[PDB]
Design an enzyme around this catalytic site. Structure first.
Site, PDB file in Angstrom:
ATOM      1  N   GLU A 186      13.707   9.051   8.207  1.00 19.32           N
ATOM      2  CA  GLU A 186      14.428   9.024   9.467  1.00 19.32           C
ATOM      3  C   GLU A 186      15.137   7.702   9.666  1.00 19.32           C
ATOM      4  O   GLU A 186      16.150   7.657  10.358  1.00 19.32           O
ATOM      5  CB  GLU A 186      13.461   9.288  10.615  1.00 19.32           C
ATOM      6  N   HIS A 227      -7.548   2.321  -4.902  1.00 20.89           N
ATOM      7  CA  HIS A 227      -7.147   1.027  -4.349  1.00 20.89           C
ATOM      8  C   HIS A 227      -7.981   0.695  -3.118  1.00 20.89           C
ATOM      9  O   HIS A 227      -8.188   1.547  -2.249  1.00 20.89           O
ATOM     10  CB  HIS A 227      -5.657   1.037  -3.989  1.00 20.89           C
TER      11      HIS A 227
END
Ligand code: 7A3
Lengths: 418, 324
Positions: free
Chosen positions: B295, B274
């Site tokens: 988190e 990509h």
């Protein structure tokens, strides 16, 4: 994608194409040195090498050359040769990359005060190009905005010495227009020097958007995109790159470790990375030989030509534990799996001798249009050559073949071809 | 962000390019989705004269008009609000800018890989001015089961049927990879009641629409009960999901995995396939993004290998509480 260019390439383009009211000094006064340099012939071409002291530094996509002690400043020519003797040809590790110092640039030393040194950088984001100036000021230039000298004076040159505002503004305006016209995405000058005698570009790093070749080829000429420091450039990579250029389909090959025993030939920009991730999660980073992918419905001939490159590369030197090839991918949207696996199968045929000498084991997992026939010809090429090939389909998890090939899990024969 | 809803079972599109296989594939999808009508109203192809092309609606042969000039197709098909652009990288910029002179077009898919980033930024700027949603560049597109599929996305009928893509389930996704979007079609169909909508945003540095553009659409779509994101090394876009959750804007469960963890282990810099898949800073690595999302409250599996397992666990928890 965006590709870094050498300082020399950037300066050649800058000196050729920049339009500024400023008088830029020392235009084209640089000399390239390699281990193959003929110093007498270098001196014939660049007599200015004797005319004043010199700066020498590598030109190899190494950043922070000054803080690495890699810039020799204010040296005679004899001083430069002495500075080069323990550096030219030596291994160097920069950060965590290791390569050989092989390309160096020599330029005139420009004596100047610290207050004649300036920092300029332009870099691309989604919302436009940020222009940085330090003697720090930063300005977003929107996608459709111009950057005129008066905009620079207003937004960036607040703290610049009053007697340098006009020449700085003219230079930075021309620099920004050059950045746009030649499809740069990053351009840093650290430092730019302005003395009583004019403007000096002492340093340059840059990336250009390499996809704009069809727009810029006239200005860029035969532009070089070196590999990052820490890797070499190989001719197989350039062969695939030339194939990639010739079609809507995507063909990409990067050699990471030519002696590695783990090779991939995976369809898809996403899947290739996931397979590579999985190989490294399982402890194989030091044996992974390559990253690459094919995607976008390449032809059978394209896949054959891609495959024969890989197969050539994994049968150069033997490895005690043999080698593995991972032929993987997602369930493709529209890539013809039969046409592409027939190309791979024909490459395998042509290399079956070498592939058996090097004790190659092939693992396959793929779905997509005609995948059932693609999986059959893979199975058949293994039976007809002697090469062990383990073939899986849509009912096997995409990456399970990595664990199989590295011995972390058993091969489930009850899943073959499904 | 822009419109919450891009496609419905009434969506009509123009296809720019001579892509008869992709168009017929769209019609096969439309048919098993029980659409009233084909999703392709007309094609535009300037290398041929006006004509008509034969396709199949089930077993019945139908004709779809092909126009040399975009203006004729637009004028003759005012019901069209989607264009799918298969123009080569050389001309995708000009044909996309031209499309955006037609107010009827609210969504554009740009297929081609290799469009310079500076041209895409200008397309993005014009699309943002006009409120047009761009999917791509460098993408297979996306799929909304029951409603519409972009070009080759999802492949042929055998795969549409096997992955239950003919009716929506409750799971929406957004990916940077087209091939992996079809792998997610498979995983999700096996672990949940199926895909409600999926988008492949493409692999370029500046996608026409980002992860968060579609994640927000999904948050605001009642039929969506959970969201899956396949991120990738490079750029900072995935941190906007963390922020959206922190702000209380994103409340549906989000499952995310970022690919490109191998790059943290390489001694040198690697540009992946990509165009956007290259980390220019430590925060842009897949390892960093994966840790940040975890988190922040995103359901992050240990690796790609455990993505299916966490999707199914989140799905089963939502069923257990009556949400699905
Ligand atoms: O072959 C593959 O696995 C990738 C792809 O070509 C496909 O057909 O799914 C994908 O649509 C793309 O366009 O890159």
């Amino acid at each position: 994608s965006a590709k870094a260019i050498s300082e020399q390439t950037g300066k050649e383009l800058l000196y050729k194409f920049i339009c500024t009211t400023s008088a830029i000094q020392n235009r084209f006064k640089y000399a390239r040195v390699t281990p193959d340099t003929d110093w007498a012939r270098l001196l014939q071409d660049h007599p200015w090498l004797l005319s004043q002291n010199l700066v020498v530094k590598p030109d190899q996509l190494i950043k922070r050359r000054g803080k690495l002690g890699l810039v020799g400043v204010n040296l005679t020519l004899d001083g430069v040769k002495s500075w080069l003797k323990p550096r030219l040809g030596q291994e160097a590790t920069v950060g965590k990359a290791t390569g050989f110092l092989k390309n160096f640039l020599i330029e005139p030393f420009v004596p100047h005060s610290q207050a004649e040194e300036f920092y300029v950088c332009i870099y691309a984001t989604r919302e436009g190009d940020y222009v940085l100036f330090h003697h720090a000021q930063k300005l977003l230039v929107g996608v459709d905005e111009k950057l005129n000298p008066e905009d620079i004076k207003k937004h960036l040159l607040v703290h610049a010495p009053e007697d340098k505002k006009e020449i700085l503004a003219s230079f930075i305006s021309g620099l920004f227009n050059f950045y746009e016209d030649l499809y740069f995405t990053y351009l840093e000058i650290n430092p730019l020097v302005v003395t009583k005698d004019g403007v000096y570009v002492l340093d340059l790093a840059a990336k250009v958007d390499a996809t704009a070749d069809y727009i810029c080829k006239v200005k860029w000429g035969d532009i070089e995109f070196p590999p990052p420091f820490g890797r070499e450039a190989y001719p197989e990579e350039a062969y695939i790159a030339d194939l990639d250029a010739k079609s809507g389909a995507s063909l990409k090959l990067t050699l990471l470790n030519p002696k590695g025993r783990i090779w991939t030939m995976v369809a898809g920009g996403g899947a290739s990375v996931v397979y590579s991730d999985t190989i490294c999660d399982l402890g194989g980073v030091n044996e992974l030989a390559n990253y690459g992918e094919y995607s976008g419905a390449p032809s059978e001939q394209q896949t054959y030509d891609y495959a024969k490159t890989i197969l050539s590369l994994m049968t150069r030197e033997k490895h005690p534990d043999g080698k593995i090839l991972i032929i993987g991918g997602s369930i493709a949207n529209f890539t013809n799996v039969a046409a592409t696996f027939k190309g791979i199968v024909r490459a395998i045929r042509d290399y079956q001798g070498p592939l058996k000498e090097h004790e190659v084991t092939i693992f396959v997992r793929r779905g997509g249009p005609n995948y059932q026939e693609g999986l059959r010809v893979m199975g058949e090429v293994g039976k007809t050559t002697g090469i062990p090939i383990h073939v899986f389909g849509t009912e096997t998890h995409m990456t399970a073949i990595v664990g199989m090939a590295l011995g972390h899990r058993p091969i489930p024969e009850n899943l073959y071809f499904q | 962000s822009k419109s919450t809803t891009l496609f419905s079972r009434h969506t009509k599109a123009i296809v720019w390019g001579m892509q008869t296989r992709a168009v017929q594939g769209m019609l096969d999808f439309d048919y098993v989705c029980s659409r009233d009508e084909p999703s392709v109203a007309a094609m535009v192809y300037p290398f041929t004269g006006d004509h008509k092309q034969k396709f199949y609606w089930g077993h019945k042969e139908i004709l779809i008009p092909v126009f040399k000039n975009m203006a004729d197709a637009m004028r003759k098909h005012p019901e069209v609000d989607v264009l799918i652009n298969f123009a080569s990288l050389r001309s995708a910029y000009d044909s996309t800018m031209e499309t955006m002179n037609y107010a009827q077009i609210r969504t554009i898919a740009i297929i081609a890989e290799g469009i310079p980033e500076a041209l895409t930024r200008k397309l993005i700027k014009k699309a943002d001015q006009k409120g047009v949603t761009i999917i791509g560049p460098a993408t297979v597109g996306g799929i909304k089961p029951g409603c519409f599929k972009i070009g080759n996305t999802g492949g042929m009928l055998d795969n549409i049927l096997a992955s239950k893509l003919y009716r929506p389930g409750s799971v929406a996704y957004v990916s940077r990879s087209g091939g992996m979007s079809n792998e997610l079609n498979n995983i999700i169909s096996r672990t949940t009641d199926g895909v409600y909508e999926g988008v492949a945003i493409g692999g370029d540095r500046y996608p026409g629409s980002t992860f968060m553009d579609h994640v927000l659409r999904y948050q605001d779509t009642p039929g969506v009960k959970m969201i899956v994101v396949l991120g990738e090394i490079g750029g900072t876009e995935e941190y906007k999901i963390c922020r959206g959750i922190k702000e209380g804007r994103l409340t549906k469960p989000i499952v995310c995995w970022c690919i490109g963890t191998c790059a943290t282990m390489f001694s040198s810099e690697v540009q992946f396939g990509h165009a956007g898949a290259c980390a220019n800073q430590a925060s842009e690595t897949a390892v960093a993004k994966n840790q940040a999302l975890k988190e922040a409250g995103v359901f992050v599996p240990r690796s790609f290998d455990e993505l299916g397992e966490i999707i199914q666990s989140v799905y089963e928890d939502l069923v257990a509480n009556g949400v699905i």
